[PDB]
Design a protein around this ligand. Structure first.
Ligand SMILES: [Zn+2]
Lengths: 46, 49, 146, 56
């Protein structure tokens, strides 16, 4: 059972290490996207 | 309510069993954490310790 | 009538209640379909173990939490798709095992928060998150090793 | 079947509007006109067995 296919290189990046957030909507199925809704404001406390 | 229904179970009989509870909660006008907290506080007694 | 702003059915895989008139994958199948059949790059989200098989390089360390952040750029690991569907992640001397996470059917969008100014930030959506991966040490290999 | 508002995630209810009957949300103006028939079969379990008795 050799690694028969796709010995894949894995790299690490840090350009956006501090800038990266993962947002998930538990109520919104992946079918619909907020790419069509024009957003108005975004307030954050870092 | 969608979160609660997803969170109990997504089998058809599960929603069938859980429907009366949703109808009951919609009978009252509780839609905000504040309203439900107020309702609970009213139903909570001063069991003063 | 709008076909994209419809109401929802409870079953996400069968969200389309009305018509115009699913298999559960494994890492070998997942990577095979997303590489061989499709050349399009895809966004994945994976949960690594708590500590990586390294030491924080002059980061003031006690065998403390050596996470992904403490490491540096460049090639960091090797992913091997073995026969019989076995998939492993050689991370130097150790070999982690990679598995399907729970298949989330809701919307997971990976955004970038670029704080260009003190009072300004660039909300940069990068792509949807379709699959989730889990990496765990092959504790059996570690044990029968010694 | 239990329909929930995509706008805010609350449970949609049935009501009657002006052009037709609509699913409506009690918290936000999201409504959906019922454009054609919608059914929700239950298929309740029947009384299959008869069970005469007196055997050995
Ligand atoms: Zn609503």
């Amino acid at each position: 059972d050799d690694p028969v296919v796709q010995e894949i290189d894995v790299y690490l990046a840090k350009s956006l290490a501090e800038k990266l957030y993962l947002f998930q909507y538990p109520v919104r199925p992946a079918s619909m996207t907020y790419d069509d809704i024009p957003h108005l404001s975004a307030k954050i406390k870092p | 309510d969608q979160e609660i229904v997803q969170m109990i179970g997504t089998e058809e009989h599960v929603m069938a069993a859980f429907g009366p509870s949703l109808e009951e909660c919609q009978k009252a006008q509780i839609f905000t954490q504040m309203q439900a907290l107020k309702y609970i506080g009213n139903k909570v007694r001063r069991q003063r310790m | 009538i709008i076909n994209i702003k419809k109401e929802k059915r409870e079953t996400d895989e069968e969200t389309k209640q009305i018509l115009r008139m699913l298999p559960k994958d494994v890492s070998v199948a997942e990577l095979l379909r997303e590489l061989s059949l499709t050349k399009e790059e895809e966004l994945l989200f994976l949960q690594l173990p708590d500590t990586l098989p390294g030491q924080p390089p002059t980061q003031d360390i006690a065998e403390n939490a050596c996470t992904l952040a403490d490491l540096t750029e460049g090639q960091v690991g090797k992913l091997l798709i073995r026969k019989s569907g076995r998939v492993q992640l050689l991370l130097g001397k150790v070999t982690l095992d990679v598995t399907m996470g729970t298949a989330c059917s809701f919307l997971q969008e990976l955004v970038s928060v670029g704080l260009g100014d003190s009072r300004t930030g660039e909300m940069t959506v990068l792509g949807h998150v379709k699959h989730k991966l889990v990496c765990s040490p092959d504790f059996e290999s570690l044990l029968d090793h010694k | 079947m239990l329909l929930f508002c995509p706008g805010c995630g609350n449970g949609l209810i049935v009501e009657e509007g002006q052009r037709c009957h609509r699913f409506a949300c009690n918290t936000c103006p999201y409504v959906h006109n019922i454009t054609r028939k919608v059914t929700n079969r239950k298929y309740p379990k029947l009384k299959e067995v008869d069970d005469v008795l007196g055997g050995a």
